[PDB]
Write a protein that binds this ligand. Structure first.
Ligand SMILES: COC1=C(OC)C(=O)C(C/C=C(\C)CC/C=C(\C)CC/C=C(\C)CC/C=C(\C)CC/C=C(\C)CC/C=C(\C)CC/C=C(\C)CCC=C(C)C)=C(C)C1=O
Ligand SMILES: COC1=C(OC)C(=O)C(C/C=C(\C)CC/C=C(\C)CC/C=C(\C)CC/C=C(\C)CC/C=C(\C)CC/C=C(\C)CC/C=C(\C)CCC=C(C)C)=C(C)C1=O
Lengths: 171, 174
């Protein structure tokens, strides 16, 4: 019933390399749906990675995301829709929400800190109140991160990746 | 105007990275802020209100890094073009790039934030960072203090970069 409006939404993440160099990246194409029973799914087109350096995007698409095998990452959660449907337009609810992220067919559970705000009769916003930190090891990507750091000669790429999102859904 | 920040509805957070591979999210519990009708905006952070979930770490940050006894407030200052924001209908959003200045521990540094402004109702707006603002320790002459914290906590490394995010609600009220 609720569908994600990609043009209004943003999913970003921060990498830290060489100890002190933080950079923010994004994915350009998301999809998402929340059904009346509160089953929520967001799908990220991993090919739509955009880090600002095209050759880096390609290396990530080949080596880390492996998009030729896994063009989609999935984020899944189960909401209690009662309090969300009760929000008046303009009103917000803080949700601390278990969810699952699936990357390459590996899944891991995290706890998200989200803010849900009703925008109008048919539009809803969900934002990360604080970014959600994932770790390469959770998806068996440690050797893939280490591979990158090297061939594109760095001291190091941090194995933690904080993820933020502003998601707009429309009825 | 004037617009005032509703602390209970807002959150300013930041991420530190330790031992190369562990990112942790922390926040401040007490903010204030005002935007005047001319678009002059100021956010104050009470730095004593740091919350990392470890009291000892909170105390080290207060004393060593923030020096709350000399500087209990950090300030964020900007000048907004109010017209396009005020023109938003409830539920509508505008992306903007906002030059701003942060003053922390008696030093200042300028940034440009990528923000989304959304009108919530006739007297309330939400402002969120679409990407965090990345502060570096050297921006505020804090490098040695970061290394001191690293040393105190027995860490092999603390990143000198700190991405800062916010979800801020402002209300046209007294
Ligand atoms: C070519 O030149 C090069 C360089 O420079 C020249 C380089 O520096 C480098 C070095 C590499 C760089 C420094 C960058 C490296 C970046 C790294 C390695 C990649 C990290 C990627 C990770 C696997 C993370 C990817 C992100 C995920 C796919 C997204 C997951 C999203 C999750 C966490 C959820 C977030 C959203 C929220 C929780 C909202 C959810 C809410 C819904 C589910 C429900 C909503 C419903 C409502 C109503 C409540 C290279 C390699 C290079 O080639
Ligand atoms: C025993 O316990 C301990 C540990 O546990 C193991 C430790 O790991 C450790 C080791 C320490 C580490 C783990 C942590 C490292 C911490 C380090 C030093 C980080 C330090 C943090 C600071 C330097 C960063 C501070 C950032 C802030 C002050 C800046 C805030 C700026 C904000 C976000 C500005 C953005 C907002 C604006 C752009 C909005 C403008 C307003 C308008 C747009 C509003 C518009 C109005 C309309 C009308 C709506 C210790 C010490 C310990 O004691």
């Amino acid at each position: 019933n609720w569908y994600l409006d990609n043009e209004s939404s943003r999913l970003s993440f921060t990498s830290t390399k060489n100890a002190d160099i933080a950079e923010v990246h994004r994915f350009l194409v998301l999809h998402g749906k929340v059904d009346p029973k509160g089953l929520a799914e967001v799908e990220v087109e991993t090919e739509s990675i955009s880090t600002g350096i095209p050759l880096r995007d390609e290396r990530l698409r080949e080596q880390v995301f492996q998009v030729h095998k896994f063009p989609v990452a999935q984020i899944n959660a189960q909401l209690d829709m009662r309090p969300i449907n009760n929000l008046a337009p303009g009103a917000q609810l803080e949700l601390r929400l278990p969810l699952t992220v699936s990357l390459r067919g590996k899944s891991h559970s995290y706890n998200a800190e989200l803010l849900a705000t009703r925008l109008d009769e048919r539009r809803f916003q969900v934002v990360t109140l604080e970014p959600l930190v994932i770790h390469a090891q959770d998806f068996d990507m440690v050797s893939d991160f280490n591979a990158l750091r090297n061939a594109a000669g760095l001291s190091a790429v941090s194995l933690s990746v904080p993820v933020g999102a502003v998601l707009i859904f429309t009825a």
